[PDB]
Write an enzyme that holds these catalytic residues in place. Structure first.
Site, PDB file in Angstrom:
ATOM      1  N   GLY A 103     -81.320  53.876  -1.171  1.00 13.62           N
ATOM      2  CA  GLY A 103     -80.082  54.303  -0.545  1.00 13.62           C
ATOM      3  C   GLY A 103     -79.052  54.813  -1.532  1.00 13.62           C
ATOM      4  O   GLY A 103     -79.232  54.709  -2.744  1.00 13.62           O
ATOM      5  N   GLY A 132     -74.477  55.500  -2.085  1.00 16.03           N
ATOM      6  CA  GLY A 132     -73.140  55.109  -1.682  1.00 16.03           C
ATOM      7  C   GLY A 132     -72.148  56.213  -1.982  1.00 16.03           C
ATOM      8  O   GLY A 132     -72.538  57.326  -2.336  1.00 16.03           O
ATOM      9  N   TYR A 136     -70.095  56.324  -4.433  1.00 17.06           N
ATOM     10  CA  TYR A 136     -70.096  56.568  -5.869  1.00 17.06           C
ATOM     11  C   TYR A 136     -71.267  55.861  -6.541  1.00 17.06           C
ATOM     12  O   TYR A 136     -71.213  55.548  -7.731  1.00 17.06           O
ATOM     13  CB  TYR A 136     -68.774  56.112  -6.492  1.00 17.06           C
ATOM     14  N   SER A 137     -72.323  55.611  -5.775  1.00 14.81           N
ATOM     15  CA  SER A 137     -73.490  54.918  -6.304  1.00 14.81           C
ATOM     16  C   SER A 137     -74.795  55.344  -5.633  1.00 14.81           C
ATOM     17  O   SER A 137     -74.808  55.803  -4.491  1.00 14.81           O
ATOM     18  CB  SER A 137     -73.314  53.405  -6.164  1.00 14.81           C
ATOM     19  OG  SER A 137     -73.307  53.011  -4.803  1.00 14.81           O
ATOM     20  N   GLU A 138     -75.889  55.196  -6.370  1.00 13.53           N
ATOM     21  CA  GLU A 138     -77.228  55.347  -5.822  1.00 13.53           C
ATOM     22  C   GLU A 138     -77.990  54.059  -6.084  1.00 13.53           C
ATOM     23  O   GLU A 138     -77.848  53.446  -7.138  1.00 13.53           O
ATOM     24  CB  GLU A 138     -77.956  56.546  -6.436  1.00 13.53           C
ATOM     25  CG  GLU A 138     -77.638  57.883  -5.776  1.00 13.53           C
ATOM     26  CD  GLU A 138     -78.510  59.019  -6.294  1.00 13.53           C
ATOM     27  OE1 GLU A 138     -78.827  59.023  -7.503  1.00 13.53           O
ATOM     28  OE2 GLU A 138     -78.879  59.903  -5.492  1.00 13.53           O
ATOM     29  N   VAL A 139     -78.788  53.638  -5.114  1.00 17.97           N
ATOM     30  CA  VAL A 139     -79.497  52.376  -5.220  1.00 17.97           C
ATOM     31  C   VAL A 139     -80.997  52.622  -5.279  1.00 17.97           C
ATOM     32  O   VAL A 139     -81.539  53.461  -4.554  1.00 17.97           O
ATOM     33  CB  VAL A 139     -79.144  51.441  -4.042  1.00 17.97           C
ATOM     34  CG1 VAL A 139     -79.842  50.103  -4.188  1.00 17.97           C
ATOM     35  CG2 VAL A 139     -77.635  51.245  -3.976  1.00 17.97           C
ATOM     36  N   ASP A 144     -66.238  44.307   3.178  1.00 16.30           N
ATOM     37  CA  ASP A 144     -67.194  45.299   3.680  1.00 16.30           C
ATOM     38  C   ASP A 144     -68.376  44.625   4.381  1.00 16.30           C
ATOM     39  O   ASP A 144     -69.538  44.996   4.179  1.00 16.30           O
ATOM     40  CB  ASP A 144     -67.688  46.202   2.544  1.00 16.30           C
ATOM     41  CG  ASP A 144     -68.156  47.566   3.040  1.00 16.30           C
ATOM     42  OD1 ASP A 144     -67.869  47.915   4.207  1.00 16.30           O
ATOM     43  OD2 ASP A 144     -68.793  48.297   2.257  1.00 16.30           O
TER      44      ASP A 144
END
Length: 326
Positions: free
Chosen positions: A33, A35, A37-40, A143
């Site tokens: 997945g 975000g 400002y992020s990638e997982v 969140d």
């Protein structure tokens, strides 16, 4: 407006210097997945051969990055909190990565339709353990939503993840209302009440809970932030909204005021149908009713939630397991 609980934890993340690990210890295998400002990624500890979650942060604001690390390290070992394994960096490039325990989770859109009455009581109780702990450590998650609650259904294991919007609570402090995801935003966020607290997470949990027992995901389905307040108003009613607005001396924008209109409170029993009735009980409705309140000060705390009769069988099973293991 302060909180009823844990108002003096951070009275009794900027100047934080973190201890970077070796980025070569971990390798990215698969993307799961992304975000804002992020990638997982699913990854691997090439030394221990153990699977992990790798979160590569687009080096936007280091203040936000350091905050998330400071919080995760403060919550380490906590019940049902995702465990931060390591914090690594490129050494040349500024780009940091957060390394987490791997959770073989089922996506909620697939999982939730298959949950039983016992499943819901069990997992909500596990989530409450996580919220109680982090609130006790003086931390709001801000969140809470099904995507941030990772459930490995086979292992009966739950982890609360994604602490990027998490913040330390200070009493009276005015916070950014641009937190949480639209469907799980509490009234405080929607009427621009900035001095909110832990209770924000309890509204979000309430939305998730309603979604599960009524099989209606999401429960409050606004087309935008203003419509989101309207959808809430159409269930809780506009009279309790007015009392809420009066208590904290808030005024709605005339246009938003027009959209909200006037609505009577809608009985929870209206959402019961042949399809979800096996998930619904007087205990479940009582519990739900004590979460979904406009006034954040009127909502159950995480600890109070765990003591609710809805979880009697979940507690009793734990107690019986303890006596037997003794």
């Amino acid at each position: 407006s302060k909180a009823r609980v844990y108002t003096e934890v951070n009275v009794i993340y900027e100047s934080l210097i973190v201890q970077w690990g070796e980025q070569d210890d971990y390798e990215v295998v698969r993307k799961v997945g992304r975000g804002k400002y992020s990638e997982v990624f699913e990854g691997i500890n090439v030394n221990s051969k153990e699977k992990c979650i790798i979160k590569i942060l687009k080096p936007v604001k280091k203040k936000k990055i350091r905050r998330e690390i400071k919080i995760l390290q403060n919550l380490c070992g906590g019940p049902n909190i995702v465990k931060l394994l390591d914090v690594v960096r490129d050494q040349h490039s500024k780009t940091p990565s957060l390394i987490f325990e791997y959770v073989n989770s089922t996506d909620f859109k697939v999982l939730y339709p298959t949950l039983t009455d016992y499943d819901i009581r069990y997992y909500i109780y596990e989530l409450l353990k996580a919220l109680d702990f982090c609130h006790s450590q003086g931390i709001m998650h801000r969140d809470v939503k099904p995507h941030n609650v990772m459930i490995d259904h086979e292992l009966r294991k739950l982890r609360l993840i994604d602490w990027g919007l998490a913040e330390f609570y200070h009493p009276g402090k005015e916070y950014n209302v641009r937190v949480a995801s639209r469907y799980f935003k509490g009234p405080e966020l929607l009427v621009d009440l900035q001095d909110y607290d832990y209770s924000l997470d309890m509204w979000s949990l309430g939305c998730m809970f309603a979604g599960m027992i009524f099989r209606k995901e999401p429960f409050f389905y606004g087309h935008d932030n203003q419509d989101q307040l309207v959808k809430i108003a159409k269930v809780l009613g506009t009279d309790e909204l007015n009392a809420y607005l009066n208590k904290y001396q808030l005024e709605l924008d005339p246009q938003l005021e027009a959209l909200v209109g006037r609505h009577s409170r809608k009985p929870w029993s209206k959402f019961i149908n042949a399809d979800n009735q096996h998930l619904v009980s007087p205990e479940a409705i009582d519990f739900l009713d004590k979460l979904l309140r406009y006034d954040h000060q009127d909502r159950l705390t995480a600890k109070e939630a765990m003591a609710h009769a809805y979880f009697a069988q979940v507690r009793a099973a734990e107690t019986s397991r303890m006596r037997s293991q003794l």
